[PDB]
Design a protein around this ligand. Structure first.
Ligand SMILES: CCCCCCCCCCCCCCCCCC(=O)OC[C@H](COP(=O)([O-])OCC(O)COP(=O)([O-])OC[C@@H](COC(=O)CCCCCCCCCCCCCCCCC)OC(=O)CCCCCCCCCCCCCCCCC)OC(=O)CCCCCCCCCCCCCCCCC
Ligand SMILES: CCCCCCCCCCCCCCCCCC(=O)OC[C@H](COP(=O)([O-])OCC(O)COP(=O)([O-])OC[C@@H](COC(=O)CCCCCCCCCCCCCCCCC)OC(=O)CCCCCCCCCCCCCCCCC)OC(=O)CCCCCCCCCCCCCCCCC
Ligand SMILES: CCCCCCCCCCCCCCCCCC(=O)O[C@@H](COC(=O)CCCCCCCCCCCCCCC)COP(=O)(O)OCC[N+](C)(C)C
Ligand SMILES: CCCCCCCCCCCCCCCCCC(=O)O[C@@H](COC(=O)CCCCCCCCCCCCCCC)COP(=O)(O)OC[C@H](O)CO
Ligand SMILES: CCCCCCCCCCCCCCCCCCCC(=O)O[C@H](COC(=O)CCCCCCCCCCCCCC)COP(=O)(O)OCCN
Ligand SMILES: CCCCCCCCCCCCCCCCCCCC(=O)O[C@H](COC(=O)CCCCCCCCCCCCCC)COP(=O)(O)OCCN
Ligand SMILES: CCCCCCCCCCCCCCCCCCCC(=O)O[C@H](COC(=O)CCCCCCCCCCCCCC)COP(=O)(O)OCCN
Ligand SMILES: CCCCCCCCCCCCCCCCCCCC(=O)O[C@H](COC(=O)CCCCCCCCCCCCCC)COP(=O)(O)OCCN
Ligand SMILES: CCCCCCCCCCCCCCCCCC(=O)OC[C@H](COP(=O)(O)O)OC(=O)CCCCCCCCCCCCCCCCC
Ligand SMILES: CCCCCCCCCCCCCCCCCC(=O)OC[C@H](COP(=O)(O)O)OC(=O)CCCCCCCCCCCCCCCCC
Ligand SMILES: COC1=C(OC)C(=O)C(C/C=C(\C)CC/C=C(\C)CC/C=C(\C)CC/C=C(\C)CCC=C(C)C)=C(C)C1=O
Lengths: 105, 116, 134, 76, 54, 157, 387, 286, 64
């Protein structure tokens, strides 16, 4: 009924959908730290970047590659600022919290 | 199917902002350079450049005197506003040369052998 | 990977092409141009070799249990790591420029890009942030 | 924004331009009213994009091929 | 232990590599079946409209 | 095509594994494996340069910052209720519903797509970045400027 | 030809010169930077086009810069203004995403930078929560943009995926029940950033909505949630920062009622009156004028807030949006009680206003006294003015 | 055939690493008016092999306070990355080969940082961050140098690339200062003199330690081949030996920098110079 | 010194012999001394067409 290319494409799309929801939900579900939350946000960005690159190949179009570069730039900038804020908050509140970087406890 | 043989040495002639107009006035130069833009600039453009520079000097002198640094602040503020005015004037002159604005003064001055 | 359609096989019919593709030798001048497949095999082979290096002294070496043998004998890094991240992104942006035969407006756009880069860098230089005294 | 990845334009750029040209040449005061008169070009553009009807035809031929081999296994 | 963790990771990777393609295959089979039902309903509507539309 | 499809499906396993484990170090190791594997997945689509950008930025630069922050800020508290409190069943239900069964997929009504490899041209990318999307390039530069200045202003003194 | 892009080159050249001037001024040990602020305001005027909304944003940001004092804060506000201006001209989801993300990063960094005293860690905490909540909304925007791009093959914003983009826009306005990031921000972050956050991004995003957005859906349940939650929350929260956060949620519910029934003229009138009231609210030193904000945010008749609410009510009744209108009228009746609590707190009390000691004597009496003359704007508001 | 080609590549890499470490000892001795290893085999030609076999029958110390997996994984990761980078040099035809090797060498930071995290030493954690800071700081100058190199690399069809077979077979006389900066960047990446202040393998014994040093010398050979391809007009045996002799010669005659000193050097001297040279070469290339 | 000469000679000989052997092996795999050249999309298309047409010529040869 369907070919090997159709299996490959549907497998890619199913994988990226589960990747997106894993990055959105999982670290919050497992009650993890802000550092792991930022890592999972990077997983969300990776899923969107893979989707854009797949579509850019699928349509023979340039816009997915432009979006890929932009996503990498924005994600790294936001992650760096978030980690700096995490370090500052940890040094401000560790004298009375111990588990200061975990707000899901 | 078989793609076009790529031309690596030819880049597309494209500016990132596209005007989406046809010019409604006679075209003297479809693509003027900076020398062409300055040498056909009107006197009102130079007047607004000098007015912006003077206003910048006075305001920079006022604001730079609160930290006792009035003269370099005045010089910097004058240059800052003056280059804003100069970019405005050069753009206006280039648009008149390309035909997107009225250029009756410019057609009777930029074509010495094509005057009449 | 093997081609799964007649259009992917240049409309060559038969069963000899399907078996010949599935049992082909790797060739950069055949069907596998620019392939990056030797990079995976190199990883597998080198991981095998280093695992054999790890495991072997657990067999052919003497060993004695001791409780003392199994015992231990700044913010500038944040600056370096974050600055390296941003500068690596900027160099990755500059790489598609250098791989093209650029015209003059491309050159001036690239120089505006570099100017914004070096202006932020020169501000951090002038405020004494690249003096690693702490 | 319609530039190709390895070619000059995308592979379904001209179908999109046909659709936008149809939308340009109508005179109805609403886009939703103009869309009802250009549905053939939008359908051809969608068929360029995803080939849903070619895939449907191949699925129907495969259903008939699987039917002519299970219900029909006639020996010589 | 280290050997237990390596064995558990290998088991999880192999089980994921064999089990998920069955989920994807079932999903694609359901989509094919629903598409064929849609094709048959469209053909039925076309025959009805040809019958009472001249 | 068993190994290629398995390599595609491994990314979702590593995405779950990042949050599943209790060790922050192991979470980062799972993320590094995921980004390397995804860079190899992107090269199945024909992208050579953008896969290398993925590797160089995320694994080379950002994960080093993650490992420095984790190694500087994480005294072991995996016993300290990271194991003794467990996880959220509502969040796991949301993940199952939205990412396993996928009641709201990105393809919408479509359920089958043909995956097609591309042929990345870096001349086309250079032309696009420096002629057609030049304003977006400059605004990306401005975002990087915000990152540099903002970090150096927010650095704890 | 690049002759149609001199304003962009002027923007970039001005940023390049301003960074170098700020560096040279700091090498002299100048503890004040009014010259840098004047150059920033000149740069703001020089890059703004000749539309009504663009100049409204420009003049608003020129007024806002008088409450900021460091060089880095001025740079972050300028680079947030670039995103705020260019979002109004965005006709795709590419530029939409980049402008929104630039604004989010600037706001996060400013929340980290400007906190002082015992409230530093509270501000950093609320900035971290805002960044984490913003990251997943940005991921939702990217994911559904990728879905739309795959389905249509183009950059048109049509189809079912626009519902999630609409939810992204509703998050950026603090619409209930996605409202709690703003409630967290109001309780800890200082007053100047609260003044910035309640005025400029709402104007930028609503202008993008007016200019280039269509969806086939509704926002009515979020109108109901915003109005009821904001009114009841401001009735129940004794801290004044939380009172004003919840009253802001109520006001954004009214603006969404104006959006939902079309008629953007009432939206623009109410938004302008609200922005002027915000400019008065966060710069008050005499507490008697806190009562004028109260009577003009309760919709009491002769003041300008009445007119801003009443054209929204008129256009809603014109197109017969009866149920949402009835809910809006009930929440308006509830809002009066806590605005009367404000009047009880700050009008029926003895007057004490401390003098300045280290100069700068009551430094924003000009703007606050100018914005109190919203009792004279109603003569122009009654006419067909905003259309 | 790919597995055969990779193993036939792997054999001279390890043989060459053994002979490099012997030749470093003996050349360093000859500069210091002595002999170096001569007893162990005729002309000392068995000394690296007996070092390897001695470490083979040496007891592996596994500290029972560390994480065993990352402790084992760090030298394996270093060795694997060195071998993969050599395969990218010789068994590839990719369009962006220099970018591939730059990406691989950017991954080599992980072995140092995993050794720093795994072992429970106070100053291993202190020195791993310094070594990573040094490698991270000089990677940017290496990348900007690659940008300057790639502006002039075009194949026959007219496409610009970083393919090694398309590089010219004459020395690049126009880029002598960039070549010198590249060589000092190679010295900084391999933690040699004058950047050898940071060690991280203080807890490793036997073949994990041997894997660390094989990876270090193989990475040195990778960077030597890369410099000979980019600046010296090709990859050859004589050029590999001459550049190795130059590195040992510099190690014989110079003292080392302090940490902040080479940080200021890499962030105030080498990066602005490579960026300015990139701008000048881009102006030339128009 | 004279003691440093044998190791330095051996490094050169090792790399010469190894590169010669690797060259012969990869030449046997690829059968043309330009296998390591850069290839764009047109050259990749040409090689893939050549491979498939060679297979077709082999298929048609075993029928006469
Ligand atoms: C080309 C573009 C040129 C620059 C245009 C943008 C920059 C504007 C900045 C500005 O006016 O600086 C204030 C500055 C006064 O600051 P300052 O006296 O040093 O500070 C004293 C304290 O602020 C305490 O004094 P203050 O608070 O009473 O006064 C603050 C200031 C301004 O105070 C305010 O911000 C409140 C004024 C509200 C009116 C807003 C007008 C918008 C109406 C919209 C209509 C459409 O006062 C004024 O009203 C000065 C107006 C001068 C002409 C403005 C044009 O005015 C000037 O020096 C003149 C600037 C005019 C151009 C030079
Ligand atoms: C740039 C960086 C450098 C890398 C590039 C270099 C190039 C490659 C060179 C190769 C590396 C050389 C050395 C390898 C390490 C050898 C193993 C070792 O020493 O122990 C690890 C050791 C284990 O940790 P530990 O010290 O025992 O425990 C400490 C934790 O607190 C304990 O944490 P925990 O207890 O929470 O974690 C337990 C975990 C422990 O995990 C591991 O054992 C590590 C896993 C990765 C190591 C891979 C090495 C070989 C392992 C076997 C692979 C078999 C896979 C299948 C292969 C076919 C065989 C039939 O085992 C599990 O139970 C896994 C559960 C699976 C996920 C469950 C969540 C989903 C549930 C849904 C339903 C389930 C179905 O530490 C590491 O993980 C070190 C990470 C470094 C590994 C290299 C990173 C890159 C890997 C290659 C690239 C990725 C491409 C993808 C291809 C296939 C995947 C690998
Ligand atoms: C992940 C676990 C390992 C999976 C190993 C694997 O898939 O093996 C491969 C790859 O592994 C190997 O072949 C190498 C085995 C590693 C151990 C060798 C030790 C050194 C001798 C099999 O290669 P072949 O199909 O025989 O080779 C295909 C043809 N061609 C030569 C052109 C590539
Ligand atoms: C202290 C500051 C003072 C500033 C003022 C003085 C300095 C002079 C101003 C700079 C030069 C003049 C402005 C630009 C001139 C463009 C006019 C033009 O046509 O010139 C050339 C146009 O080429 C350029 O230099 C183009 C510049 C491109 C700039 C691209 C970036 C624009 C800005 C993007 C910012 C994005 C927005 C950010 C916020 C979202 C080529 O001339 P031609 O067509 O006659 O020659 C033909 C030849 O074959 C080459 O084409
Ligand atoms: C690519 C090429 C990269 C080149 C990088 C250049 C780095 C510039 C940093 C200079 C900072 C040092 C400094 O204090 O510079 C002051 C001004 O320099 C400047 O303003 C120089 C700005 C150069 C912009 C490029 C000197 O003067 P000062 O302000 O210290 O003197 C009066 C107070 N004593
Ligand atoms: C039982 C089920 C086991 C499932 C395992 C799933 C994941 C596989 C991971 C790699 C396995 C290696 C051996 C498999 C063969 C292989 O390479 O498969 C290729 C798929 O790519 C891949 O598998 C890509 C994954 C590569 C990850 C390795 C990362 C190396 C990191 C080193 C740094 C690299 C720097 C960048 C260059 C294509 O095989 P084919 O069909 O073409 O082969 C035959 C035709 N000749
Ligand atoms: C004296 C005040 C105190 C001093 C402090 C100054 C504060 C900073 C500046 C004010 C900030 C608030 C402004 C908010 C934005 C309101 C204006 C938005 C534009 C608008 O309403 O639409 C235009 C009507 O303009 C109009 O004429 C709208 C009328 C004014 C609306 C504001 C009402 C409250 C006063 C129509 O646009 P169009 O039809 O030309 O567009 C078609 C081409 N796209
Ligand atoms: C609520 C605010 C009003 C407070 C008192 C309401 C009392 C109930 C209304 C009685 C109206 C008389 C009546 O029954 O006549 C109806 C006339 O329809 C109508 O026209 C119904 C109009 C009644 C409501 C008008 C009040 C609106 C005031 C403003 C509300 C806010 C904005 C709108 C949401 C339908 O007659 P039947 O069905 O009994 O006849 C049976 C034979 N068919
Ligand atoms: C050194 C400091 C950084 C310099 C670069 C910062 C800005 C990046 C370059 C923007 C270039 C904009 C177009 C320039 C152009 O068309 O020049 C050709 C143009 C051709 O000469 P013409 O014969 O007068 O047309 O050159 C000039 O006249 C301007 C000289 C270049 C100056 C670049 C910087 C402008 C502000 C100072
Ligand atoms: C008592 C309330 C007084 C408010 C004054 C309203 C003046 C509106 C002028 C608009 C106009 O002429 O357009 C100029 C112009 C459009 O005409 P153009 O000059 O032909 O482009 O746009 C502007 O400059 C708009 C100015 C908006 C000011 C902020 C909004 C109200 C506060
Ligand atoms: C001053 O600098 C130096 C050091 O300080 C940084 C050192 O530490 C060492 C000592 C350390 C060494 C030599 C270890 C690294 C090298 C190794 C293990 C050699 C690798 C060689 C291999 C794999 C080939 C040998 C194996 C063979 C031939 C197989 C045999 C098989 C059979 C007989 C069946 C040296 C010499 C040195 O100069």
């Amino acid at each position: 009924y369907y070919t090997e290319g159709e299996i490959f494409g549907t497998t890619f799309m199913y994988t990226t959908n589960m990747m997106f929801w894993a990055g959105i939900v999982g670290a919050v579900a497992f009650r993890r730290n802000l550092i792991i939350l930022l890592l999972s946000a990077e997983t969300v960005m990776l899923a969107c970047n893979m989707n854009f690159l797949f579509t850019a190949a699928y349509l023979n179009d340039i816009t997915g590659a432009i979006m890929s570069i932009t996503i990498t730039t924005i994600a790294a900038c936001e992650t760096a600022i978030g980690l700096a804020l995490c370090v500052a908050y940890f040094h401000m509140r560790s004298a009375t919290d111990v588990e200061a970087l975990n707000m899901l406890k | 199917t078989w793609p076009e043989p790529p031309n690596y040495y030819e880049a597309p002639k494209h500016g990132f902002k596209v005007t989406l107009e046809n010019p409604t006035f006679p075209i003297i130069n479809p693509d003027p350079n900076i020398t062409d833009a300055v040498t056909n600039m009107r006197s009102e453009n130079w007047g607004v450049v000098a007015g912006l520079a003077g206003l910048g000097y006075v305001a920079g002198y006022y604001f730079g005197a609160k930290v006792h640094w009035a003269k370099p602040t005045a010089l910097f503020t004058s240059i800052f506003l003056g280059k804003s005015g100069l970019l405005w004037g050069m753009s206006d002159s280039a648009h008149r040369l390309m035909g997107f604005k009225e250029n009756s003064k410019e057609v009777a001055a930029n074509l010495p052998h094509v005057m009449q | 990977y093997n081609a799964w359609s007649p259009a992917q096989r240049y409309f060559v019919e038969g069963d000899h092409v399907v078996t010949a593709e599935a049992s082909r030798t790797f060739q950069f001048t055949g069907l596998d141009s620019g392939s990056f497949y030797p990079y995976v095999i190199a990883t597998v082979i080198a991981t095998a070799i280093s695992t054999v290096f790890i495991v072997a002294p657990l067999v052919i070496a003497p060993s004695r249990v001791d409780l003392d043998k199994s015992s231990a004998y700044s913010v500038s890094f944040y600056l370096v790591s974050i600055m390296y991240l941003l500068f690596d992104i900027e160099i990755a942006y500059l790489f598609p420029y250098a791989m093209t035969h650029a015209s003059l407006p491309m050159y001036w756009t690239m120089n505006l890009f570099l100017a914004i880069l070096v202006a932020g860098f020169a501000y951090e230089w002038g405020m004494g942030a690249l003096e690693w005294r702490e | 924004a319609g530039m190709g990845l390895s070619t000059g334009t995308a592979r379904c750029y001209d179908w999109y331009m046909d659709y936008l040209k149809c939308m340009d040449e109508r005179k109805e005061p609403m886009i939703a009213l103009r869309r009802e008169h250009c549905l053939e070009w939008l359908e051809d553009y969608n068929e360029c994009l995803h080939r849903e009807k070619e895939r449907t035809r191949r699925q129907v031929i495969e259903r008939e091929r699987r039917a002519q081999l299970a219900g029909g296994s006639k020996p010589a | 232990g280290l050997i237990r963790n390596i064995a558990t990771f290998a088991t999880a990777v192999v089980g994921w590599s064999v089990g998920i393609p069955f989920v994807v295959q079932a999903r694609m089979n359901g989509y094919v079946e629903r598409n064929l039902a849609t094709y048959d309903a469209a053909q039925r509507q076309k025959a009805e409209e040809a019958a009472i539309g001249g | 095509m068993f190994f290629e499809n398995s390599a595609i499906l491994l990314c979702a396993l590593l995405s779950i594994a990042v949050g599943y484990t209790k060790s922050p170090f192991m979470s980062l190791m799972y993320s590094v494996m995921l980004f390397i594997n995804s860079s190899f997945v992107l090269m199945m689509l024909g992208f050579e340069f953008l896969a290398l950008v993925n590797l160089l930025v995320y694994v080379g630069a950002l994960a080093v910052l993650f490992l420095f922050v984790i190694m500087l800020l994480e005294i072991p508290a995996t016993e300290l209720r990271a194991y003794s409190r467990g996880w959220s069943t509502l969040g796991i239900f949301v993940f199952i519903i939205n990412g396993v069964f996928q009641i709201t997929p990105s393809m919408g009504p479509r359920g089958i797509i043909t995956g097609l490899p591309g042929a990345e041209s870096i001349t086309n990318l250079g032309h696009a970045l420096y002629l057609y999307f030049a304003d977006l390039l400059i605004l990306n530069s401005l975002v990087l400027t915000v990152a540099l200045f903002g970090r150096f202003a927010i650095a704890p003194v | 030809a690049a002759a149609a892009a001199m304003i962009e080159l002027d923007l970039c050249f001005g940023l390049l010169l301003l960074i170098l001037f700020g560096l040279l001024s700091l090498r002299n040990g100048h503890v004040s930077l009014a010259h840098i602020r004047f150059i920033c305001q000149c740069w703001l005027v020089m890059i703004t086009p000749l539309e009504v909304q663009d100049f409204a944003l420009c003049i608003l940001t020129v007024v806002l810069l008088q409450s900021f004092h460091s060089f880095e804060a001025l740079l972050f506000l300028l680079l947030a203004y670039i995103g705020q201006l260019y979002m109004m001209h965005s006709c795709n989801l590419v530029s939409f995403y980049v402008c929104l993300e630039a604004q989010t990063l600037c706001v996060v960094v400013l929340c980290g930078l400007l906190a002082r005293g015992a409230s530093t860690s509270f501000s950093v905490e609320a900035a971290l929560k805002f960044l984490l909540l913003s990251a997943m909304v940005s991921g939702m925007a990217l994911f559904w943009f990728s879905a739309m791009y795959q389905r249509t093959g183009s950059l048109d914003m049509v189809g079912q995926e626009t519902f999630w983009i609409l939810l992204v826009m509703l998050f950026k306005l603090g619409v209930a029940p996605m409202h709690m990031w703003s409630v967290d921000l109001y309780g800890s972050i200082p007053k100047s950033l609260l003044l910035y956050l309640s005025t400029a991004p709402k104007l930028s995003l609503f202008t993008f909505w007016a200019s280039s957005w269509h969806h086939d859906f509704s926002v009515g349940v979020f109108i109901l949630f915003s109005m009821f939650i904001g009114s009841i929350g401001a009735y129940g929260q004794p801290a004044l920062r939380s009172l004003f956060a919840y009253s802001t949620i109520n006001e954004i519910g009214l603006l969404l009622l104006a959006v939902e029934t079309a008629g953007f003229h009432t939206l623009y009138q109410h938004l302008g009156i609200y922005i002027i009231t915000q400019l008065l609210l966060w710069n008050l030193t005499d507490k008697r004028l806190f009562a004028l904000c109260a009577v003009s945010l309760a919709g009491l008749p002769p003041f300008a807030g009445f007119f801003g609410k009443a054209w929204i009510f008129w256009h809603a009744m014109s197109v017969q949006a009866f149920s949402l209108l009835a809910a809006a009228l009930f929440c308006t009746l509830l809002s009066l009680v806590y605005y009367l609590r404000v009047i009880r707190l700050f009008w029926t009390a003895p007057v004490h206003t401390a003098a300045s000691f280290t100069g700068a004597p009551n430094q924003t009496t000009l703007t606050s006294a100018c914005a109190v003359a919203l009792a004279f704007a109603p003569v122009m508001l009654v006419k067909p003015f905003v259309i | 055939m790919i597995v055969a080609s990779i193993l036939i590549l792997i054999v001279p890499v390890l043989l060459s690493v053994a002979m490099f470490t012997l030749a470093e000892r003996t050349v360093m001795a000859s500069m210091q008016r002595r002999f170096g290893p001569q007893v162990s085999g005729i002309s000392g030609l068995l000394q690296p092999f007996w070092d390897g076999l001695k470490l083979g029958v040496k007891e592996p110390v596994l500290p029972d306070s560390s994480s065993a997996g990352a402790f084992a994984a760090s030298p394996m990761i270093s060795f694997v990355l060195s071998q993969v980078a050599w395969v990218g040099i010789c068994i590839s035809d990719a369009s962006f080969q220099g970018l591939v090797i730059m990406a691989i060498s950017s991954l080599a930071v992980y072995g140092v940082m995993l050794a720093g995290w795994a072992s429970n030493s106070k100053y291993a954690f202190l020195g791993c961050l310094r070594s990573v800071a040094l490698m991270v700081s000089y990677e940017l100058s290496l990348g900007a140098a690659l940008l300057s190199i790639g502006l002039f690399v075009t194949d026959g069809t007219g496409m610009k690339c970083l393919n090694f077979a398309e590089m010219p077979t004459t020395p690049q006389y126009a880029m002598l200062p960039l070549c010198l900066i590249f060589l000092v960047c190679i010295l900084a990446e391999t933690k040699r003199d004058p950047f050898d202040l940071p060690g991280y393998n203080v807890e490793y014994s036997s073949l994990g330690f041997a894997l660390f040093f094989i990876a270090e010398y193989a990475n040195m050979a990778v960077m030597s081949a890369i410099a000979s391809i980019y600046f010296l007009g090709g990859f050859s045996a004589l050029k590999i030996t001459a550049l190795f002799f130059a590195f040992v010669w510099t190690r014989g005659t110079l003292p080392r920098y302090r940490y902040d000193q080479f940080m200021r050097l890499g962030w105030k001297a080498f990066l602005p110079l490579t960026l300015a040279f990139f701008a000048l070469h881009a102006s030339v290339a128009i | 010194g004279w003691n440093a000469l044998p190791s330095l000679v051996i490094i050169t000989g090792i790399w010469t012999a190894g590169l010669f052997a690797l060259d012969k092996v990869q030449m046997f795999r690829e059968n043309k001394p330009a296998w390591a050249n850069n290839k764009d999309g047109w050259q990749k298309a040409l090689y893939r067409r050549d491979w498939y047409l060679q297979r077709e010529e082999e298929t048609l040869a075993m029928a006469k």
